[PDB]
Amino acid sequence: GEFVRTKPHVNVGTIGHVDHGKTTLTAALTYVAAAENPHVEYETAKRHYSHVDCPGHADYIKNMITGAAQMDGAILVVSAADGPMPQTREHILLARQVGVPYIVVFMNKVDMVDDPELLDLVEMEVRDLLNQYEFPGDEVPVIRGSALLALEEMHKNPKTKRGENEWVDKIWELLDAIDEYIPTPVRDVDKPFLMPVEDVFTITGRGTVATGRIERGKVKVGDEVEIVGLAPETRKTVVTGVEMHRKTLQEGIAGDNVGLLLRGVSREEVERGQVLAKPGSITPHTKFEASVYILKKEEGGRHTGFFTGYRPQFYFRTTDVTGVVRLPQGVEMVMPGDNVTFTVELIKPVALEEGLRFAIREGGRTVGAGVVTKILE
Amino acid sequence: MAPVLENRRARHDYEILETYEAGIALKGTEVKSLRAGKVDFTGSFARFEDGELYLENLYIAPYEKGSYANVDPRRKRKLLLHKHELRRLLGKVEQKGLTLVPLKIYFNERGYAKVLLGLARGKKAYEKRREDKKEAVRRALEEL
Amino acid sequence: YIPGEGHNLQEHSVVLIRGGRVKDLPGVRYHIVRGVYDAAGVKDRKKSRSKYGTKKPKEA
Amino acid sequence: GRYIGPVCRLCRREGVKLYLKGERCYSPKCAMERRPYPPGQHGQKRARRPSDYAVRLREKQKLRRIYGISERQFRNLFEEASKKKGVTGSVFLGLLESRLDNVVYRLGFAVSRRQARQLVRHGHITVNGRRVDLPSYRVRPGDEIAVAEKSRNLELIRQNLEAMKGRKVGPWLSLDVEGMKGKFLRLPDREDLALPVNEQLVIEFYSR
RNA sequence: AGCUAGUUGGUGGGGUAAUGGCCCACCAAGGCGACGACGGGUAGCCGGUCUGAGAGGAUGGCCGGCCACAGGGGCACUGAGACACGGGCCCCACUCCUACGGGAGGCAGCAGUUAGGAAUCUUCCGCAAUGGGCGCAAGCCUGACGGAGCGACGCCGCUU
RNA sequence: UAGCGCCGGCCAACUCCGUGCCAGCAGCCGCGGUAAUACGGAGGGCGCGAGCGUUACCCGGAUUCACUGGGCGUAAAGGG
RNA sequence: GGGGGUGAAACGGUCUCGACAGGGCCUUUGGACGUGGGUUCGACUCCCACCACCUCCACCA
Ligand SMILES: C/C=C\C=C\[C@@H]1O[C@](O)([C@H](CC)C(=O)NC/C=C/C=C(\C)[C@@H](OC)[C@@H](C)[C@@H]2O[C@H](/C=C/C=C/C=C(\C)C(=O)c3c(O)cc[nH]c3=O)[C@H](O)[C@@H]2O)[C@H](O)[C@H](O)C1(C)C
Ligand SMILES: Nc1nc2c(ncn2[C@@H]2O[C@H](COP(=O)(O)OP(=O)(O)O)[C@@H](O)[C@H]2O)c(=O)[nH]1
Ligand SMILES: [Mg+2]
Ligand SMILES: [Zn+2]
Hints:
Chain B is about 25% helix and about 30% strand. Chain B is an alpha+beta fold. In chain B, about 25% of the residues are buried. Chain B binds 3 RNA strands through β1, α2, β4, β5 and α3. Chain A: Its EC number is 3.6.5.3.
């Protein structure tokens, strides 16, 4: 099956506390949306969606960040029976750190425990919470419903069309809240090309494939790239297939979450944290200085000052490597607040460019935020 | 919980007059390796550059666990000695050809790597047999 | 044998064996090829590099 | 490929004057004059009694360096030389000379072979009508070495070819200095190429 | 260091295109072995190839010739020819479809994957040529083949 | 575009500093113990050149299985 | 990508006795128990996030 692009394409995930509905919901959207048109996907008349389904734990956060770094908007799933909880709160914060645009909301479990206030109380405290993080709390859409009941009835009749069931409809009140509100954004299909790698797997009788969201530019069956980073020396290759959701794409425009087939590589050469830059642009390095704003007790987490030794973890695109902070000479220490410029040396070499926004996370709480000044390695 | 280390090889080698016990500046990644006892004193005399003593040439295996963190085995590790004790050893060292040698290594009550130094006979001239015909003829040839 | 000055080989690292005894150390008959797998080239090295893993240091 | 670097450097060292540059390497500064000794921090100190190898080396190095031809080309040529019928200490020289770039030099055009080299590679020189940009093209008995039309009115083919007004050409060569033609009469012999080299030792260097 | 009973031979058969213990009855006790049989290990053989003053030694990758095999193993059918690489029957192993009763398959063709390893390539272009098969012919098929691709793997030429 | 090997002897190519049988080299002999042409860098030189070195394997050298072309009193080798 | 495992004694109480270094002859704080940081008046001990190994799962655009 050859993938044929028609409607604009957007990337959107679904985050929230555990057991609130995320997984079910996704199942929900999927069937509900598919009833109309003959990590998941769904076309909704106006648009075409790729739904990443954040499944992990406070142990699996090394994917939460990645998952969110993409998606031009996120569905915050909150249980009606329970209401905002720590993971419901934690994601929001990240959706904020990772810098996600617009956050739709879906109170789920409305089919259970009925209470006049409960729904309004909760709908009010969710907004409250968002507002506590600089998100359009009041302005943001909050759909009430039951993922299960929609999904359930969609199994009963996988043909159920909108208007034929109150539960299925609520899903549309969401798909709709997503069709409008969450805006499709700027792509940048006119720059070089580059794509971080999120997952590398071997397709039998074909070879290695690398997936991720095309950062900038495009890629076509027959072009040439250079897997850069995390490897002793960059590898130059040629692509032999651009696929999207098991469908044959002809040209991978930016913003596309796609799988790229790398001719000749062995699954050990590729990883998660490299990039498929087009030759010439980008090059591995391990040293640089940069402007880094350091969040205070108030946010992120650092509540004391850090010296030069510090070996925080630096998150670039899809991965994160530990690095050493070579404070400039004549500074001596940084403290919560202020934007300091300092030199750092990553133990592992990673693709870098002039202005690359990266973050600093240590001890489980984001301690800093910054852009790359100059490359020295 | 580390066994008493020892320089059996030079305890006999040089005559021992006075002794001195001092703590060292261990890297810890090293303190591990010392507790495992994997370290020898072969070819290691202790001196002091400037006014501080530094046990030099002491080999402390790397810590497998420690990965990239460990420092090189032969390092100019620094020792800790009372100021009046340090000057007495300098008086003897600068003035005459007496060495300071690692006599052994262990951990005291408190549990710190504590090295035991010794007073050295020194001397021990290393006989070097010489002049190989080959060279001799060789030079004659060229010079003239 | 592990050539050069300094190494990064652990009690379980992946190495590539070359072949060359060491008239000095008894039953030692193979040199470890520096610069392959876990065996790292020689830091700071600048002379006979080809035979010590280390790549050409840019004259910075 | 072909050395490319301090040549009036090999002039000395070898100690027996070289002229890969032509004019300068001909004037009162062939580098030799002022520095008849070999290069380096040393260069002028008791030069230890050379060894039987050092000699064979220096001889072949001498001769070779006297063309630019890199070892592979040189040596590869010597081999074939050996094979062929007749003495080799001559035939090896017979071929070292049929080398177009050399012939083109032996016959003016360039105040040196290095300058005879850049002269072929750039299509300037020709052979029997059609051009040849192959320094390695071994010249046969008869094939004249005429210049080009875009090459003549050149500020440099002038000067060079104006050093012909008077001076004679190799005993196995002719020279219509007007149409810049001239042929290749016959295969040169040991004397005609009274070179500062003892071909024998070069036959031996290539044994051990 | 001894080996052998279809073993060696004989008469008559069976079989094949044809000789023959190739197979079978029957008769005889034979056959081979230090000039190395039997057994073990290794191995496809040659033209050549590398080396060597040579006589020798080492090798058999590419290209040509012969042999053997086609997942392991047995068998025949068809046919001028096969006991048949992309034909068939059967057992075995393994993977795949199933409505669980039986189906489909074999890359040591080309290209490609994975495993193993120090290490070995494009899911390509064309039947224009040469060669083949079928056909009166036009023509069809030909991953033979003619080419392009990737790798300093090698040789020769070339540049800075 | 210019790289790579080597510079104690065999083997073509030498000096300063660093280290002080340590760190290290290494094909053989062997270097390293406080002026190291042998270790590390630099300067310089040599060889070679889009290549240069290493490793493995074959022949050579090896008349060291000798037919060409060896030996056996004491070197291995005369059978009690 | 995750889970688990190993980073000294089934162990909350000083300080390398000491020299270097910043305040207050003697007190003292730092440094050294893989690295980076937290929490304590105070950690080798206790949380965290890294590192290197080990081990068990996951993984076909
Ligand atoms: C942070 C993880 C990964 C980041 C990855 C990279 O980040 C980026 O580098 C990014 C570039 C700016 C980056 O540097 N991110 C890195 C940083 C980004 C920081 C931005 C935006 C800030 O503004 C200064 C923003 C969060 C800010 O905080 C405020 C709120 C703070 C709340 C703190 C916690 C509170 C109360 C709390 O109760 C709380 C809790 O949540 C957990 C535990 N216990 C708690 O008690 C407010 O909501 C503001 O909005 C790029 O986006 C890259 O492309 C990237 C996405 C790959
Ligand atoms: N009562 C009720 N339960 C639901 C509804 N949707 C999902 N659930 C239940 O919520 C539990 C967790 O759902 P899940 O999708 O795994 O949430 P996740 O933790 O975000 O993945 C499951 O047992 C679902 O059956 C709903 O609409 N109503
Ligand atoms: Mg889930
Ligand atoms: Zn000159």
